[PDB]
Amino acid sequence: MEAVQNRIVEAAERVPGVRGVIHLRARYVGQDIWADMIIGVDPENTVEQAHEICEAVQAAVCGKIRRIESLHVSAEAR
Amino acid sequence: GSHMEAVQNRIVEAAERVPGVRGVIHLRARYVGQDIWADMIIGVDPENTVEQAHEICEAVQAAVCGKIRRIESLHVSAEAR
């Protein structure tokens, strides 16, 4: 499952605001994926702003990788 | 159980008296052998920086982990409130 994580990470890295993927845990349950992602972000963004980035990553990542059934994202400094 | 309820009321109470914290939003704590692994989420001013939020978080960690020594691991994170 490493083209997929690669897919996910890349979908992540392209979203406006995302400084990098700090961490990903993705598992298959059947053929769906469930995953939890920690993105890196600009430390001078706000908590509000960082949350808006997390949302964006989620829509984008779940949109591009359709087999993901459930995805959580959080944000941290760079 | 009631001892874990006691320990949690203590985790909340330590974290809640760090300036910066607008509340405990969530707290999971469980024994892994004889120590606690907890993961918690603190409420913070939305207009705080990420860098700042992390400073509140790190400081909650220090307070909680120093007052409750049972705890071998604690991960703190901020969200708005």
UniProtKB/Swiss-Prot annotation, chain B:
Keyword Metal-binding: yes
Inducing factors: Part of the probable 17 gene mamAB operon.
Record GO cellular component, one term: magnetosome membrane
An example Gene Ontology molecular-function term: monoatomic cation transmembrane transporter activity
Result when mutating V50W: Significantly reduced magnetic response, many fewer, much smaller magnetite crystals formed, still stabilizes MamB, CTD dimerizes, binds fewer cations
Primary location recorded for the protein, binned into one broad class: membrane
Effect of H75A: Wild-type magnetic response, no change in magnetite crystal size, number or shape
Effect of disrupting the coding gene: Single gene disruption has no growth defects, no accumulation of magnetite, forms empty intracellular magnetosome vesicles, decreased levels of MamB, mislocation of MamC in 1-3 foci or rarely in a shortened chain. Magnetosome vesicles are fewer and smaller, aligned in a chain with the filament, only a few have very small crystals. Other, possibly precursor magnetosome vesicles are visible. MamI mislocalized to cell inner membrane or in 1 to a few patches.
UniProt KW tRNA processing keyword: no
Subcellular localization: Magnetosome membrane; Cell inner membrane
Documented effect of changing M40P: Severely impaired magnetic response, cells make very few, small magnetite particles, less MamB and MamM protein accumulate. CTD no longer dimerizes, CTD has cannot fold properly and is unstable
Region of interest (C-terminal domain (CTD)), residue spans: 5-81
Record: residues binding Fe cation 1: D39, H75
GO BP terms: iron ion transport
Binding-site residues for Fe cation 3, renumbered to this chain: E79
Residues the record lists as binding Fe cation 2: H54
UniProt entry keywords in alphabetical sequence: Biomineralization, Cell inner membrane, Cell membrane, Ion transport, Iron, Iron transport, Magnetosome, Membrane, Metal-binding, Transmembrane, Transmembrane helix, Transport
Assembly: Forms homodimers via its C-terminal domain (CTD) in the presence of metal cations. Interacts with MamB via their CTD. Isolated CTD forms homodimers.
Other information: This bacteria makes up to 60 cubo-octahedral magnetosomes of about 45 nm in diameter which contain membrane-bound crystals of magnetite (Fe(3)O(4)). Expression of just the minimal mamAB gene cluster (MGMSRv2__2365 to MGMSRv2__2381), including this gene, is sufficient to form a minimal magnetosome chain with small magnetite particles.
Function description: Essential for magnetosome formation; required for stable accumulation of MamB. May nucleate iron crystal formation. Probably binds and transports iron. Binds divalent cations, possibly up to 3 Zn(2+) per dimer in vitro, probably iron in vivo. One of 7 genes (mamLQBIEMO) able to induce magnetosome membrane biogenesis; coexpression of mamLQRBIEMO in a deletion of the 17 gene mamAB operon restores magnetosome vesicle formation but not magnetite biosynthesis.
Family: Belongs to the cation diffusion facilitator (CDF) transporter (TC 2.A.4) family.
Record remark on domains: The C-terminal domain (CTD) is probably responsible for hetero- and homodimerization; it assumes a V-shaped, dimeric metallo-chaperone-like fold that can open and close. Val-50 forms the hinge between the dimers. Binds up to 3 divalent metal cations (probably iron in vivo); upon binding there is a conformational shift to a tighter dimer. If the CTD cannot fold correctly the function of the whole protein is decreased, suggesting the CTD confers functionality on the transmembrane domain (TMD), perhaps activated by ligand binding to the CTD.
Protein name: Magnetosome protein MamM
Organism, scientific name: Magnetospirillum gryphiswaldense (strain DSM 6361 / JCM 21280 / NBRC 15271 / MSR-1)
Gene (name only): mamM
